[PDB]
Each structure stands twice: as structure tokens, then as C-alpha cells.
Design a protein around this ligand. Structure first.
Ligand SMILES: Cc1cc2nc3c(=O)[nH]c(=O)nc-3n(C[C@H](O)[C@H](O)[C@H](O)COP(=O)(O)OP(=O)(O)OC[C@H]3O[C@@H](n4cnc5c(N)ncnc54)[C@H](O)[C@@H]3O)c2cc1C
Ligand SMILES: [Cl-]
Ligand SMILES: [Cl-]
Length: 381
């Protein structure tokens, strides 16, 4: 009778539900989500123009069909407002839900920045299917887009928006695209690719003030640049949602702290996907999420199981300069060598044995991904 309760109907929630329903078709299942509950592949948000798709074109199933497929009750546009571990329950406003076990699959939030001016609140985040719909409707008939951020998400959107016919300015105070992810030579190759589409980068400044001007906006940068635009996309980065777990007394660090079996610090509470920090690893992509869904499904069905991440390369969706990057496993390093030329770069990290432990591949060099993957150590030992 007491139900499995899953907070979140993104890829983590729905893949855990599906993998677990292969093992247990009789226990009640309750999923809760603050959005509309549609099943969609979030990575596809940044290909909407290049694929000629709107938000509906990206959805794979509606919540009712999902509830039927998973033999679940799914609560939509429903916001969980607290967790009460000592009583095996969660709060929604002034209502409680009791659980057999609780799964935190509630993802990451956009990183905000300080902005002044009368239009300071006219920033569009794009972090789910509803954000996207709302952005697509506002972008209809428009031409000039200012984008904040120069990470993976900002670059993919910059490339995609451009291919959609938009004029792009990218603003970020960091000194290169994808800092922390990319070797500088590789970063330089990717930036040149995007600039070749007409994207203009403003690296160093931040947005100081956003103001209504005539029938659009003027973006006042900290360096005195003032760039006219129709809309502003805020894509600085993402941070796991941890506030509610902290208040409830669960260990949090960058994400919710879980072991390789996805268990939080408290009995009967687990976590996975973007919100989870799994044995030190908070990995904001699908490959690890899927590994976690397979193992936790087992554990929730009485077969205690742990993940053991193998190599998980990141493919960055920038057709202007294709990119695959596989950072070396943490607490492991070697010499970085840049090979190739112009914008077709193969950057390899070799350990003291001479083995390739990480790489960054741009342009034509991405064709080497499948060969080089055979060299890689797993992300966990
Ligand atoms: C534009 C972009 C491009 C990407 N491209 C790739 C790619 O090419 N390859 C790749 O591997 N990864 C990619 N990713 C990363 C990948 O999409 C994410 O890692 C993955 O979607 C995370 O899934 P999730 O279910 O953990 O989180 P989310 O999809 O964010 O889901 C969180 C869920 O929790 C719900 N929720 C949150 N708070 C509450 C609350 N308090 N109460 C009730 N419900 C709540 C939300 O409604 C949502 O259903 C991309 C991400 C972005 C945004
Ligand atoms: Cl990012
Ligand atoms: Cl941060």
C-alpha cells in the first residue's frame, strides 16, 4: 500500500519509474512534478531550430499516457514544498504525502546573475519544455537575441538560434567558452566556429542593466557597451536543487550527497540525475543518469545494487564546430598534447604510462571518438 514516491518527471524520474516497473508491477507509484508532466528529451531543446521543431514537436508523451504506461498516479503543476524524513512524508503546501521510499529526481536550477533597469526581469531561462514554449512564442517574429553564459548550454543555444536565423550576442565574464570543461585551444576552435556563423562574443563584461528602448531592449554591459536586442536568454549554468534537502537535514555538497547505491544520508530517501552528487560526482548529463536509474531500480525492488561509471564522453551539440570532450577522471592527470590543425583539433591527455585518459576533439577530429573511447578509464574505480 505505502507508495514509491518520485519527485520529478524529467529523464531521471521517468527512466527510474520505467526501469523499476520492469521489476515491481504491484507497489503503488506516485510521481510529482511542478511542470506539465510531458515526457520529452531535454537535450533536444537546443536543436529545435535546426530540426524545425517547436515544444510540442519535442514531447514524446503526455502525462496521462505516461501514468497509464507506468501504472502510476502523476501529479502535475504540483510543487513539493518540504521533506519530513523523520515521518516518511513530504509536504505540498498544507497537504502531506506519506511514502515507502522517496526518490529526489528534481534536477538543477539556472544560475542567476544580478541585473538592474526597468526590464531586469525580461530574462528567459530555457531549462525545461515549458521554458522553451514560452521562449519560442516570445521569439516569434524577432531577430536579435542576447545570450548570457558561455558554457555548454549557452554555446549549443547560440549555434541553434543562429541556424534558426537569429542574430546572436553572447555575454559572459569568463575568458573562454566552456571554462573548466575545455582545453583553451579546443575552446578557441569552438568560438571561431560560432563566430563564423555571425555570433559575436563579449567575454569579460557582465550585463549591468536591461532597459526598454523603443520596441525592444537595450542591454547595458559593465564595460559601457550597449547592445540592442529583442530578447535575452539566461544560460549561465546550472546548479543542483539542494535547499529543500538541506532544510530537511540531508547531506548536500554541490548536489544531494548519495553513495553509489543512490542513498542519501537518511533511510528511505534516494536521489539521482542532475540533483544528485554520486560518490563525489555531480554529472549534469544523461549517460550517468541512465546508469543510476538501472541500479536504483534494482535497489528499490530489493536487489541492492551500486553504479560503477565507465567512460562517459560529452558530445557538445555545436554543428558549426562539432565537439566531443572526455575530461580525465578526477584525481588523475597527465600531459595535454594538441594535435591537428586550424579548427580540426585532437587534444589528448596521456598519463605517465602513456595511456590516453582524456581528450577534446573538434571539427573533423570527432570522427576519432569511437577509436579513442577504447583507451578510456572509467569515471569510477
Ligand atoms: C539545453 C540543454 C542541452 C543538453 N544536451 C545534452 C546532451 O546533448 N547530452 C546529454 O547527455 N545531456 C544533455 N543535457 C543535460 C540533460 O538534459 C540533463 O542531465 C537531464 O535532462 C537531467 O534530467 P533530470 O530528470 O535529472 O532533471 P530535470 O529534467 O531538470 O527534471 C527535474 C524534475 O523535477 C521537477 N521538480 C523540480 N522541483 C520540484 C518541486 N519542488 N516539486 C515538484 N517537482 C519538482 C521538475 O518539474 C522536473 O520534472 C542538456 C541539458 C540542457 C538543458
Ligand atoms: Cl552550461
Ligand atoms: Cl554556483
Amino acid at each position: 500500500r505505502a507508495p514509491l514516491v518520485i519527485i520529478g518527471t524529467g529523464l531521471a524520474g521517468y527512466n527510474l519509474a520505467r526501469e523499476w516497473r520492469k521489476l515491481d508491477g504491484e507497489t503503488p507509484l506516485l510521481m510529482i512534478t511542478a511542470d506539465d508532466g510531458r515526457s520529452y528529451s531535454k537535450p533536444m531543446l537546443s536543436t529545435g531550430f535546426s530540426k524545425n521543431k517547436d515544444a510540442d514537436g519535442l514531447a514524446m508523451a503526455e502525462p496521462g499516457a505516461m501514468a497509464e504506461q507506468l501504472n502510476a498516479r502523476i501529479l502535475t503543476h504540483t510543487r513539493v514544498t518540504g521533506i519530513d524524513p523523520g515521518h516518511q512524508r513530504i509536504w505540498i503546501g498544507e497537504e502531506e504525502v506519506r511514502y515507502r521510499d522517496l526518490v529526489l529526481a528534481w534536477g538543477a536550477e539556472p544560475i542567476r546573475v544580478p541585473v538592474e533597469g526597468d526590464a531586469q526581469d525580461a530574462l528567459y531561462p530555457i531549462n525545461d519544455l515549458e521554458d522553451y514554449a514560452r521562449f519560442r512564442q516570445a521569439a516569434a517574429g524577432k531577430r536579435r537575441v542576447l545570450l548570457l553564459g558561455a558554457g555548454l548550454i549557452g554555446c549549443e543555444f547560440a549555434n541553434d538560434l543562429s541556424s534558426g536565423g537569429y542574430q546572436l550576442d553572447v555575454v559572459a565574464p569568463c575568458e573562454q567558452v566552456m571554462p573548466g570543461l575545455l582545453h583553451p585551444a579546443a575552446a578557441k576552435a569552438v568560438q571561431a566556429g560560432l563566430e563564423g556563423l555571425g555570433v559575436r562574443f563579449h567575454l569579460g563584461p557582465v550585463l549591468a542593466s536591461l532597459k526598454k528602448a523603443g520596441e525592444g531592449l537595450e542591454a547595458h554591459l559593465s564595460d559601457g557597451e550597449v547592445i540592442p536586442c529583442d530578447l535575452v536568454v539566461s544560460a549561465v549554468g546550472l546548479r543542483p536543487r539542494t535547499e529543500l534537502a538541506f532544510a530537511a537535514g540531508l547531506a548536500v555538497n554541490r548536489g544531494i550527497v548519495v553513495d553509489r547505491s543512490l542513498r542519501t544520508s537518511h533511510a528511505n530517501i534516494y536521489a539521482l540525475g542532475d540533483c544528485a552528487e554520486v560518490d563525489g560526482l555531480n554529472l549534469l548529463y544523461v549517460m550517468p543518469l541512465m546508469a543510476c536509474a538501472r541500479a536504483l531500480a534494482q535497489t528499490l525492488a530489493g536487489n541492492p545494487s551500486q553504479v560503477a561509471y565507465g567512460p562517459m564522453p560529452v558530445t557538445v551539440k555545436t554543428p558549426a564546430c562539432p565537439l566531443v570532450v572526455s575530461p580525465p577522471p578526477r584525481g588523475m592527470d597527465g600531459q595535454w598534447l594538441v594535435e591537428g590543425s586550424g579548427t580540426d583539433l585532437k587534444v589528448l591527455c596521456r598519463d605517465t604510462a602513456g595511456r590516453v585518459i582524456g581528450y577534446a576533439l573538434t571539427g573533423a577530429a570527432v570522427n576519432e571518438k569511437l577509436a579513442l573511447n577504447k583507451e578510456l578509464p572509467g569515471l569510477m574505480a
